[PDB]
C-alpha positions as a Python dict, from the first residue, in 0.01 Angstrom:
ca = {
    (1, 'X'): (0, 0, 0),
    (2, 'X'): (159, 283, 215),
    (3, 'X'): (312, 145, 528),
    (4, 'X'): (102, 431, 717),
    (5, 'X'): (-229, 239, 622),
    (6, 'X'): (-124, -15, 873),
    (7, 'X'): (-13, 151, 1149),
    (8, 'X'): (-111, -133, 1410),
    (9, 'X'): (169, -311, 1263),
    (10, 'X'): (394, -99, 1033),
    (11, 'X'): (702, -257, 1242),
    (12, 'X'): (603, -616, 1129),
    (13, 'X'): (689, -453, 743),
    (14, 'X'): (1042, -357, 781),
    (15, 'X'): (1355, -603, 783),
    (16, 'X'): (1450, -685, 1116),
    (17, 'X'): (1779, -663, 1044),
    (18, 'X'): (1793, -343, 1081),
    (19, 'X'): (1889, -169, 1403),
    (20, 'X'): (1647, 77, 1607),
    (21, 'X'): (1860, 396, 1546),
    (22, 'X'): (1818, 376, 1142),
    (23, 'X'): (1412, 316, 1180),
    (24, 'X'): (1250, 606, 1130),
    (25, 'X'): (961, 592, 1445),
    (26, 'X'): (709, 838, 1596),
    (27, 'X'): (751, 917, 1960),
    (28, 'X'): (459, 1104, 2173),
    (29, 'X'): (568, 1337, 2402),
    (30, 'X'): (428, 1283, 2762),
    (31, 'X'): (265, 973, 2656),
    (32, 'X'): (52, 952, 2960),
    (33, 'X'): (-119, 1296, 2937),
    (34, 'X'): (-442, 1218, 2771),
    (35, 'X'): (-578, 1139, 3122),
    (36, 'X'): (-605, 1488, 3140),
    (37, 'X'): (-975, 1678, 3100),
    (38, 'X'): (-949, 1989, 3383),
    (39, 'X'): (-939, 2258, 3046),
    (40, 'X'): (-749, 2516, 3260),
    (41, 'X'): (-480, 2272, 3356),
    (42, 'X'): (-512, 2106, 2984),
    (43, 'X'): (-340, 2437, 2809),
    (44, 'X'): (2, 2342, 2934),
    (45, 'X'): (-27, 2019, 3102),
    (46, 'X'): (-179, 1788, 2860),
    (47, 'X'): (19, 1673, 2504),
    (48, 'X'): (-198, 1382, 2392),
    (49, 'X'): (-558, 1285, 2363),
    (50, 'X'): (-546, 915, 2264),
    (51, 'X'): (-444, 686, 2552),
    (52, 'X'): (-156, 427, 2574),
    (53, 'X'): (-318, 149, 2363),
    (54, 'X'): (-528, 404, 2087),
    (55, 'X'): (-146, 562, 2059),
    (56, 'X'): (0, 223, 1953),
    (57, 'X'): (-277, 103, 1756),
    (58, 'X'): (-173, 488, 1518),
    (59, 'X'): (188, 360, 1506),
    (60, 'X'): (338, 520, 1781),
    (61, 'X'): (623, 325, 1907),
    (62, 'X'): (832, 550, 2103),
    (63, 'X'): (705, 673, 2482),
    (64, 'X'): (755, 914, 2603),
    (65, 'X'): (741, 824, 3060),
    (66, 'X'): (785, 1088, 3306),
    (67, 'X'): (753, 955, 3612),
    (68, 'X'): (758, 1102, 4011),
    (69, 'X'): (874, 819, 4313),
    (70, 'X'): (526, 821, 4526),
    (71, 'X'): (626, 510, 4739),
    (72, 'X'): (901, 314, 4757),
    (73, 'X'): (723, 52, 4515),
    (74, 'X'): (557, 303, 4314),
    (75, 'X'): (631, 494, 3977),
    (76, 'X'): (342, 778, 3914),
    (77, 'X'): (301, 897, 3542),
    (78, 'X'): (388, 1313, 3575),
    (79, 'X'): (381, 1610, 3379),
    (80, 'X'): (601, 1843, 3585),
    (81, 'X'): (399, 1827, 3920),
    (82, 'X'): (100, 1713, 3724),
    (83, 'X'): (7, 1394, 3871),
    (84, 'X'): (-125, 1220, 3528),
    (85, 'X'): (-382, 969, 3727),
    (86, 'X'): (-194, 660, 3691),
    (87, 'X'): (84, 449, 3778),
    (88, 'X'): (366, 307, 3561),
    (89, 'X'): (237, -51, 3589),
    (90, 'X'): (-37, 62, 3353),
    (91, 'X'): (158, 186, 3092),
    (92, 'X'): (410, -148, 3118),
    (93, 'X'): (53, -367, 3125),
    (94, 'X'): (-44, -170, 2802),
    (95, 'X'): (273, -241, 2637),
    (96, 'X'): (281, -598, 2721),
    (97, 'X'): (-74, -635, 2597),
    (98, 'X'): (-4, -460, 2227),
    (99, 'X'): (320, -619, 2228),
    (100, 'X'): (169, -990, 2271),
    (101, 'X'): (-104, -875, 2000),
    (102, 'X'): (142, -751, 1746),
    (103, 'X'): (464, -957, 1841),
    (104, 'X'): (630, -815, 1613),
    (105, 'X'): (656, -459, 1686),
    (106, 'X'): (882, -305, 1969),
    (107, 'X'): (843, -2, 2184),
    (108, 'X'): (1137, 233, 2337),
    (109, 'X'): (1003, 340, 2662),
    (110, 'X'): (1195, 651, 2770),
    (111, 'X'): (1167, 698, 3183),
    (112, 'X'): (1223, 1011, 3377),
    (113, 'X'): (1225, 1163, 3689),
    (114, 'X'): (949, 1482, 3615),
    (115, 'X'): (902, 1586, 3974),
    (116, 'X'): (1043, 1550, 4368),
    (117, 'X'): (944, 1285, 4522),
    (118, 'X'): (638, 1228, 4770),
    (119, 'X'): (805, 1269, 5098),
    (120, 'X'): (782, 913, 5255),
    (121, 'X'): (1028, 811, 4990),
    (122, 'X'): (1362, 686, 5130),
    (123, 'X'): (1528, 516, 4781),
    (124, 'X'): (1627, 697, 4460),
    (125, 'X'): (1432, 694, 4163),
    (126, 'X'): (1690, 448, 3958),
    (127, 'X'): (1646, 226, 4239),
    (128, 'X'): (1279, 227, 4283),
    (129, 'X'): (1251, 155, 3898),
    (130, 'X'): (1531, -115, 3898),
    (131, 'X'): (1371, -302, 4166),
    (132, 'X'): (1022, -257, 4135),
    (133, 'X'): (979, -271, 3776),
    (134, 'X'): (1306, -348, 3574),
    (135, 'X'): (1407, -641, 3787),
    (136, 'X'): (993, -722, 3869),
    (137, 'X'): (926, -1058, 3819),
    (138, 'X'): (566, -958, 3781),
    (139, 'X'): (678, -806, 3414),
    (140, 'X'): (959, -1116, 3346),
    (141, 'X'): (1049, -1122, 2947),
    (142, 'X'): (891, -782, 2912),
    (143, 'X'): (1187, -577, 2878),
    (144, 'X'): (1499, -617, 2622),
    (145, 'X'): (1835, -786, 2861),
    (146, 'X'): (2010, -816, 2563),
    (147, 'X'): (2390, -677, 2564),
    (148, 'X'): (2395, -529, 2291),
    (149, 'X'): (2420, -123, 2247),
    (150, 'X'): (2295, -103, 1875),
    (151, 'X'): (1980, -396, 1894),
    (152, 'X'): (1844, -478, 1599),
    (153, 'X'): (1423, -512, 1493),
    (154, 'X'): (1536, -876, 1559),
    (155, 'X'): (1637, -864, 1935),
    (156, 'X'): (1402, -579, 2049),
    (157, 'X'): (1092, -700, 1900),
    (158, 'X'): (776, -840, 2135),
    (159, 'X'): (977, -620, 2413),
    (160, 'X'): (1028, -256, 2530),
    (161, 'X'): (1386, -111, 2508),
    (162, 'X'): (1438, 81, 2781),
    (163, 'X'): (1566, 443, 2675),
    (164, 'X'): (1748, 581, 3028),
    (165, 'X'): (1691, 949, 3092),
    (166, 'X'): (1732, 877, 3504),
    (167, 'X'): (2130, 906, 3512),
    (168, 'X'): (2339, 680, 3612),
    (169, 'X'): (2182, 335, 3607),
    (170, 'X'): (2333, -16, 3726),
    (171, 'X'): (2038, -167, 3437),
    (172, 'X'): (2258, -309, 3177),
    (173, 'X'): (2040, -291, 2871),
    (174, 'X'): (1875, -3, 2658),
    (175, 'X'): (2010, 292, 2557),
    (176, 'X'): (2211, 483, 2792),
    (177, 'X'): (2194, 218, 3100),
    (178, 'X'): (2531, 224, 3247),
    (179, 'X'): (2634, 423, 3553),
    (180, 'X'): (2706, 756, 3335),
    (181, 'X'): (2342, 735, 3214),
    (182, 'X'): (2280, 1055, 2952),
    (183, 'X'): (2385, 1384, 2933),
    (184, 'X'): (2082, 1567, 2849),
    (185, 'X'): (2132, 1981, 2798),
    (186, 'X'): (1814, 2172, 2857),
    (187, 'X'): (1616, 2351, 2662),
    (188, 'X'): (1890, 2273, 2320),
    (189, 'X'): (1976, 2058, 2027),
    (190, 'X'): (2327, 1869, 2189),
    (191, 'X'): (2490, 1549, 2073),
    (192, 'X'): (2645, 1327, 2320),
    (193, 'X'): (2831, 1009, 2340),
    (194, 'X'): (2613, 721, 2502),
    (195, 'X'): (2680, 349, 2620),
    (196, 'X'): (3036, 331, 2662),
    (197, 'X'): (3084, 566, 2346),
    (198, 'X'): (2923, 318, 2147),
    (199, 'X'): (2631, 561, 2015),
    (200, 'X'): (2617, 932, 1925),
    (201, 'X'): (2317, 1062, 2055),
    (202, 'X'): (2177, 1370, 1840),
    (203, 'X'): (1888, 1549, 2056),
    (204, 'X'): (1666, 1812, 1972),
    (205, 'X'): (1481, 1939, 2265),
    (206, 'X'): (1464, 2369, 2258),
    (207, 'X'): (1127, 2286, 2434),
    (208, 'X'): (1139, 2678, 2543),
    (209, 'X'): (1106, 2766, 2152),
    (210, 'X'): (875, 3049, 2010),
    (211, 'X'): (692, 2921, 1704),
    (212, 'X'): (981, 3000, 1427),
    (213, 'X'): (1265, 2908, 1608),
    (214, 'X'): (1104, 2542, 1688),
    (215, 'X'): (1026, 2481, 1361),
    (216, 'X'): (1394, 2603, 1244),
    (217, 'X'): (1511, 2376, 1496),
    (218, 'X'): (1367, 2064, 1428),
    (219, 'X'): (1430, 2113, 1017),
    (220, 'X'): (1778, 2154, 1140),
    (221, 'X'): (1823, 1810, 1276),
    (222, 'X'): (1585, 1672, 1021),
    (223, 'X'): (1800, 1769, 743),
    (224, 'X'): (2136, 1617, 924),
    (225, 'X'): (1960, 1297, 968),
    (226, 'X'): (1883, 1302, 611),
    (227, 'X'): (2253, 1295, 516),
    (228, 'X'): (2326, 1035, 785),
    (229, 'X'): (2329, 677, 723),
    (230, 'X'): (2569, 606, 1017),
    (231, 'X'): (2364, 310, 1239),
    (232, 'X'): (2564, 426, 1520),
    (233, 'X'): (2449, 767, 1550),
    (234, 'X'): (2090, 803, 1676),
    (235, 'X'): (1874, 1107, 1661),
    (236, 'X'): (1534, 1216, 1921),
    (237, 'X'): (1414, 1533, 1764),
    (238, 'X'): (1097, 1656, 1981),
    (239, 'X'): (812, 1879, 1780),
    (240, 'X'): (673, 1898, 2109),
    (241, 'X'): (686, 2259, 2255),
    (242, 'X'): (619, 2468, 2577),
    (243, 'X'): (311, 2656, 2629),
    (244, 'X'): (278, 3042, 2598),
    (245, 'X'): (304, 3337, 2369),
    (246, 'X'): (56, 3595, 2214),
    (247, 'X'): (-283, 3468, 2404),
    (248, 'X'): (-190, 3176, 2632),
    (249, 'X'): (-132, 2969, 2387),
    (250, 'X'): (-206, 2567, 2424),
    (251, 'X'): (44, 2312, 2346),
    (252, 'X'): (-260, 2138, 2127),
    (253, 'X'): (-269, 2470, 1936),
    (254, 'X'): (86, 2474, 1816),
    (255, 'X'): (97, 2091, 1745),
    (256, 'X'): (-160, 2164, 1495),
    (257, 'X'): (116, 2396, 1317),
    (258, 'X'): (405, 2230, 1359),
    (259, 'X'): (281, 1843, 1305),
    (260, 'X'): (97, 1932, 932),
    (261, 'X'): (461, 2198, 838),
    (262, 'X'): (680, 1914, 945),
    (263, 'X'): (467, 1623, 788),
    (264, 'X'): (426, 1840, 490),
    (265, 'X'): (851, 1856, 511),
    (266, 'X'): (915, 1488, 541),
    (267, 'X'): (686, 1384, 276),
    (268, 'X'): (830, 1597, 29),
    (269, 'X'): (1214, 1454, 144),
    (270, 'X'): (1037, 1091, 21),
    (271, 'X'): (1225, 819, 199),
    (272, 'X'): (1520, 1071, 380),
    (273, 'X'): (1616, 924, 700),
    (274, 'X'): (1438, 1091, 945),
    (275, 'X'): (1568, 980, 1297),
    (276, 'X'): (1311, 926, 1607),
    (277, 'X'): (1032, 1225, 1637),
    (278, 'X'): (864, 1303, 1902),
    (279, 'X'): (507, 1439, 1907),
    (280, 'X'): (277, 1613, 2095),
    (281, 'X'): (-84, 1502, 1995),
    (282, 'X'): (1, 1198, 1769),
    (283, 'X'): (-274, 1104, 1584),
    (284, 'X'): (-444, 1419, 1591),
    (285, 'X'): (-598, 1515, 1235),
    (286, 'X'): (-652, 1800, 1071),
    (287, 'X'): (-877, 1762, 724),
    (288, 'X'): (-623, 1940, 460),
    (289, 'X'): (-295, 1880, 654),
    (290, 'X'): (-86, 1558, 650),
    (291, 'X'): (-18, 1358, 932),
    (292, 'X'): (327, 1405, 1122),
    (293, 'X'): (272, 1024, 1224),
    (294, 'X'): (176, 899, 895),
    (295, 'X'): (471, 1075, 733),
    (296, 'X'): (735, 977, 954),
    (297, 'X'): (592, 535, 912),
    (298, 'X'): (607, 631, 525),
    (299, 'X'): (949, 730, 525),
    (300, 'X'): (1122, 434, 608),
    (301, 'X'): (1251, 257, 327),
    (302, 'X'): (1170, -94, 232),
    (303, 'X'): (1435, -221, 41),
    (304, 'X'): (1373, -622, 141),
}
């Protein structure tokens, strides 16, 4: 059977020899979002309905994190200046409970700084996350310390890999933790050299888009992964757009056009390489439309 009929463990199918960059994995952007239920606020703010655990148990295994410093020990989980209702330590207790369930599987757990922080804060951001959940010994073994730039299924599995987007980090392992961190271009589709030049980083992100142009440019990276077999080149290519337009138009509302047109894409490409995609709403169904999520598990190849 389809790999997507077992999305609770569709990691646990693959061969673990192969490295993170050439799985094919659904991402959800703003992970933490489904907290969310003001409907005003819920047109732009929220991305996601399931929470953390409901997300992993449909086969998401990249997060999404956006965080804002609110104490000197504490990460809070932000859209913007959207306080989200929770604290990072909820999201890492999450993981490490799915993780010990399904040992097997691994999550990359993006983290960013979203929003200034509160104004008792006296560290940075990196340091505050280093220190207080990193190097915590309250979540010891949780995270990959490997050395490795390119960790394979293998190495990363029954952990989270971090995936930097704070800047320069002095957190040794993940992708992009050195003290150049990642060079991320707003609102575009860049490519960038990451951990000491070991990994080409190919980034969709025109989170600005109207309608066409978003699709366009996610088909656009979607169809250069699909020629790529390179294990060294690794490619985040976010659905996930900006609310706005001809009413006010929800970011719910055009997830329900993009996730079915690019699902719909994918499936047709069979097994294509499809790089890491990153959804708004994963796990949302539509009777009549296929499943971004489901499509993107499917893809990968099992050749073992």
């Amino acid at each position: 059977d389809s790999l997507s009929k077992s999305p609770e463990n569709w990691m646990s199918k693959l061969d673990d020899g192969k490295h993170l960059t050439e799985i094919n994995i659904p991402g959800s952007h703003d992970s933490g979002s489904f907290t969310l239920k003001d409907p005003v606020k819920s047109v732009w703010a929220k991305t996601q309905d399931k929470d953390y655990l409901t997300q992993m148990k449909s086969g998401v295994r990249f997060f999404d994190i956006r965080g804002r410093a609110s104490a000197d020990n504490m990460i809070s989980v932000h859209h913007g200046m959207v306080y989200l209702h929770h604290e990072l330590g909820k999201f890492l207790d999450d993981a490490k409970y799915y993780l010990s369930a399904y040992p097997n599987e691994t999550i990359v757990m993006s983290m960013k700084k979203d929003y200034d922080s509160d104004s008792k804060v006296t560290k940075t951001f990196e340091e505050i996350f280093r220190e207080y959940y990193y190097n915590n010994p309250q979540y010891q073994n949780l995270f990959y310390t490997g050395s490795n730039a390119n960790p394979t299924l293998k190495e990363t599995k029954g952990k989270i890999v971090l995936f930097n987007r704070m800047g320069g980090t002095y957190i040794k392992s993940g992708y992009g933790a050195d003290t150049s961190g990642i060079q991320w271009a707003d609102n575009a589709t860049f490519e960038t050299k990451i951990n000491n030049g070991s990994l080409n980083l190919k980034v969709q992100d025109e989170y600005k888009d109207y309608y066409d142009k978003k699709v366009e440019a996610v088909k656009n990276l979607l169809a250069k992964a699909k020629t790529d077999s390179n294990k060294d080149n690794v490619y985040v290519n976010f659905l996930s757009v900006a609310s706005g337009g001809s009413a006010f138009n929800s970011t719910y509302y055009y997830a329900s056009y993009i996730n079915p047109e690019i699902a719909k894409t994918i499936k047709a490409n069979g097994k294509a390489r499809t790089g890491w995609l990153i959804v708004d709403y994963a796990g949302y169904t539509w009777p009549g439309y296929d499943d971004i999520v489901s499509e993107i598990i499917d893809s990968n190849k099992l050749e073992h």
